[model samples]
Target: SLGAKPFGEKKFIEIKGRRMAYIDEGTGDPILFQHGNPTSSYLWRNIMPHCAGLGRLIACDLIGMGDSDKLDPSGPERYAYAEHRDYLDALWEALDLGDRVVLVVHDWGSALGFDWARRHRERVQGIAYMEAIAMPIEWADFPEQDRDLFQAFRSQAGEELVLQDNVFVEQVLPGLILRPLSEAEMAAYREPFLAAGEARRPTLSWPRQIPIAGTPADVVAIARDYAGWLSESPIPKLFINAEPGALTTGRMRDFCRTWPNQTEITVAGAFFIQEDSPDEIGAAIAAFVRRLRP
Candidate 1:
């Protein structure tokens, strides 16, 4: 609260029967930022200012993360990927985001973005993404050991890791980014889920929603559909790549290259590129927006 994102006044609105918290700042056109797991709208704190002049920058905390309200902890089902998708759809409709706005996303935001973006394809003027579940892939996309570990996170072990031990925030989160996170930075993320306790269904459910081999056919289908759209869409695109990162690695870079109106920039960060390379990433997005706005 004392040293968080200077998103002016935090805005609150009732959406899908819960208070949805978001940062709505600056003004012009809209730049919508949707974050991934283990983090929230706060993830855009430093990144937002860099793009301030570009438009009315907005970032939101999904139902169970950040300063937003939580869902029932009756079971993980409440936080299933589909359920999160449902809430986002409602919030999107409630906010009445207008049309043709810029999208800034990371991690699970890619999946959620695709789920909604496809339905509103012509409405997305441009997209800036990094370390995301932006498309579907085979198991060989990752190295063996890493794949096994990610699989474990999607299994019952994932529940134990996130719900029981809170490892995602404590250990995994810190490891994802290239730069070191201060106690204050870590606290911003850790305290929210810690406060959530058993209401931490979203954290536990995100990994399992990865849609490996079409197991979660619903989620996979969204990505697969978007991948097709991405291949043909004429919209401007920016793919922010992290060095030696897992999701945005080798083959992914090649895919970014193929987009008709896309440009790829590599930053010296790991999975959480924003934390380590926000200045560059934000500037890149802002500049990219400049080209599209006029």
Candidate 2:
């Protein structure tokens, strides 16, 4: 779906016994691209080449999503933000990413990247993000149009909508994209959740993890800390969003407006700007990375 072909060969690395899948290309300062719920490294397929040669590009599939090893859902509480964070930390150690790392992140990926950057402030080079869970948001801060649907996602029916229905991959994704996705593209998104209920745990867990009004205290804490880091970290930053952006609205949108050392760009899109304007997004990233070079 990245124009001609789909995402290519994936490389796997062991993280805490389970395998984590990733795409690695080029050589230089590391540009680690992290995707959010219901998306894998494939999310960066079209965007990677544009940043090629500018840096070493790497995008990893979060645990239990994409081609990565799925954890047994037998445990009562699993696939939460902390579990995912631990696995990603392990991946970071295993990969031994050096100091000079740039992060291109979206959705939940933004949270993970921002958290990592905040904790390891010395190592990160910069961050570029869209539709991010970048701050602690209030229920009122949610987009009015989709607020009710997301409210449903946090309710009991979410299991039906996300796990049984595979809504994120099938419905939410297509609805947000400006252009229609081809069958092949849709199939790739569908591949991971073909097993149904248990396999869709990540999708179900992520929405509920949203730090709204401080309900999920831990998640809110992470966002709160990173938000402080993002505001003050003098490192280069890029903020990209679409018209009527979903998650990155309200308070987060207000913060991005005056964020220090940040460049903001608006594109023609709904939610998934990467899908709607990959070329525009990619070229912007290329330019952003180029400017970061010494």
Candidate 3:
């Protein structure tokens, strides 16, 4: 059984009329782990234990991913960036997580987590970013070829392919972690997409929500403004970037350089730094937390 014993008790809280599953474990200060797309709180399995002993580790499955209930794509319920922000707000409120939080974010988790941090700046004491998107300039950083691909995928013409194709499980998921996942591990990533067309709401909607260029796009504007604020915030921030071919390699170093209170640690492997380089990632976070203590 690749699945480890539950680190904490599992609880589902109603947020915006949807049940959001989360794990709240250990004791001490709180460290909240926010996962990205496709995979959910499961991605934090390996790294959670290391941090749990130091403090409470709270990991949640974003709406429509992992153990959480999927949303209705046709309905007016907004699952875009703004809605995700609100969902996070509701989760925090329901849990009564106060200030002095250490945020650990990855992939789409970056956008969602950072946006919330920007809104509740006073609540954030520190941040540990792992292969997550933090810069609004990310869209501009894309090369012409990549931008074209993004545009095509966001277009109505590419919607079918994006929705039906299991690119996440088939490609992105496999490459993110350093080690080859067992059949069970792989299934953990694939299970979310079990229903034939169930992935459309999350997969197709992700790119469309990217705030590429300017203020013309509302989501992008929010991301850009929040990223700018994150850059300027004096809060201690550490970025753990997977090396060689990290998905977020292009911008990780730059983000660290731009932020006065931020530092970057590189882990050789893929996007899931914990799986690829758990020792390095764990050490870096542990060190950062230690240094932050009074």
Considering every candidate listed, which one attains the maximal lDDT? 2
Clashing pairs in 3: 211-220
User: After best superposition, candidate 2 residue 19: deviation in angstroms?
Assistant: 0.9
Q: Compose the digit string of candidate 2's lDDT tens values, residues 111-214.
A: 88889988888998888988877788888886677888889988988988987889988888888887898887787778888877778888888898999988
Model 1, 25: alpha-carbon shift in Å?
A: 0.6
Give per-residue CA lDDT, model 1, range 123-180, as digits (tens): 8888888776766667777767567667878777877777778877887788877778
Q: List CA RMSD, all candidates.
A: 2.3, 1.6, 2.8
TM-score, every prediction? 0.93, 0.95, 0.88
Give the lDDT of residue 154 in candidate 2: 88
Which stretches of candidate 2 lie above 4 Å from their native place? 1-4, 74-76, 247-249
Between 1 and 2, whose lDDT is larger?
A: 2
Models sorted by lDDT, best on top:
2, 1, 3
Better of 2 and 3 by lDDT: 2
